[PDB]
Design a protein around this ligand. Structure first.
Ligand SMILES: OC[C@H]1O[C@@H](O[C@H]2[C@H](O)[C@@H](O)[C@H](O)O[C@@H]2CO)[C@H](O)[C@@H](O)[C@H]1O
Ligand SMILES: OC[C@H]1O[C@@H](O[C@H]2[C@H](O)[C@@H](O)[C@H](O)O[C@@H]2CO)[C@H](O)[C@@H](O)[C@H]1O
Ligand SMILES: [Ca+2]
Ligand SMILES: [Ca+2]
Ligand SMILES: [Mn+2]
Ligand SMILES: [Mn+2]
Lengths: 239, 239
């Protein structure tokens, strides 16, 4: 059974277990800022940042056909400081091909290049989308399950509690092929849930890099923060 | 589309929208005590109590083959006051045949009569089991999904935060046939999740009564409270 596990209760500047890409940065206070915050302390527009765990994870084995069960938990906050233009774009927890670089930002969230459903993406993502693009449902923010496309196969609207910490739990049970995610805001006590069937063998490569990506908007000040406070992950391949 | 919905932010003594059975009682303070609390304020052993919503709900239609999607949310607390004997037995959210009466108590939780998997039960339940019976996993307490048997098809251990309020969300998406449940303890911030595939058409009658049932143990003082503070439910049949 090969297992891989990690827990960052806080982020350490300079640690070598995380690959930071784009605007991503760890502050001296221990928080991971996925998108840029300016000198005056406000979120910068046109920013994309990602953080990938530095070891690939063996998610399924073609020789035996077994696939791993996994769980990830993370805490984040989004602060939207201006009434207009509308804030944008959101953050995503994703799994895809190893050694990837950032793709398009804005509504593609640093992981897709257009809005087609293309099997060559080989990407699974759980988004927290704050801007309604032509491919989105009208309600934002929303949690969405993305399978080889920014056009989610399932969406769940949620209300943002501005600048408050949200706790996320995403679990995948390989036997039932069920991906279930929960978002809880301790401040208001709000609980949101989403679940869909996803057979990972049809989507992902055998080895994947796991990460978080965030992006701000395409026009001046269409921005918000995408701060992450802790992140843990565990995966077990019955092999 | 026929919908049925209800929300009790608190329980009103004497309201006629709830059928109370066994030891079940609503206090003047608005809480639903599923099992008996003695004069000295401690939970009584050998007690079984249930509360059913007074209108049946149309869960699936044989003529069109459509099945309803539903969601229920409730808050409860369990207080276990003695170190020995082990506390028992737990509470369950259930759906089954209309006009039912309490079945066996103790580990059967007021809804089964033995530990066989019998299709004539026609019962779906999500339990919060506090005592490990011969049919249980060794870890208690645990959340379990029961389909025509007290022998759960899926189990998830959780740690009890004694006497604290737990918030539960159970959702069923008819399209994917996914039953997903979440338990959150606001006090510790603990989040537990369980999900399994359940095709309701193979289990339930077309019309069901929905309820909550609780039971205490078979020997002196193997007991705990099973207090419910609020309960809401909504179901929609695309018909
Ligand atoms: O406004 C944030 C939002 O912008 C979209 O891009 C717009 C851009 O803002 C606008 O100035 C330009 O004329 O056309 C673009 C076409 O939509 C992004 O696509 C969206 O993701 C957000 O970033
Ligand atoms: O102790 C609570 C526990 O009791 C089980 O029943 C026991 C009973 O306690 C014991 O005194 C008797 O000799 O045998 C019974 C067989 O197990 C219940 O089955 C269980 O659900 C709890 O209620
Ligand atoms: Ca979007
Ligand atoms: Ca039991
Ligand atoms: Mn979206
Ligand atoms: Mn059990």
């Amino acid at each position: 059974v090969e297992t891989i596990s990690f827990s960052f209760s806080e982020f350490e500047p300079g640690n070598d277990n995380l690959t930071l890409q784009g605007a991503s940065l760890i502050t001296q206070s221990g928080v991971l800022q996925l998108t840029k915050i300016n000198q005056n302390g406000m979120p910068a527009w046109d920013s994309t940042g990602r953080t990938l765990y530095a070891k690939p994870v063996h998610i399924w084995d073609m020789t035996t056909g077994t696939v791993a069960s996994f769980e990830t938990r993370f805490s984040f906050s989004i602060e939207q400081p201006y009434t207009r233009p509308l804030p944008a774009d959101g953050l995503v927890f994703f799994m895809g091909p190893t050694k990837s670089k950032p793709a398009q930002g804005y509504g593609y969230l640093g992981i897709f290049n257009q809005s087609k459903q293309d099997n060559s993406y080989q990407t699974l993502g759980v988004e927290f989308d704050t801007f309604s693009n032509p491919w989105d449902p009208p309600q934002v923010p929303h949690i969405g399950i993305d399978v080889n496309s920014i056009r989610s196969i399932k969406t769940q609207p949620f209300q943002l509690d501005n600048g408050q910490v949200a706790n996320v739990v995403i679990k995948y049970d390989a036997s039932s092929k069920l991906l279930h995610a929960v978002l809880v805001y301790p401040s208001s006590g709000a609980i949101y849930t989403i679940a869909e069937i996803v057979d990972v063998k049809q989507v992902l490569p055998e080895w994947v890099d796991v990460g978080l990506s965030g992006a701000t908007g395409a026009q001046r000040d269409a921005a918000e923060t995408h701060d992450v406070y802790s992140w843990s992950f565990q995966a077990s391949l019955p092999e």
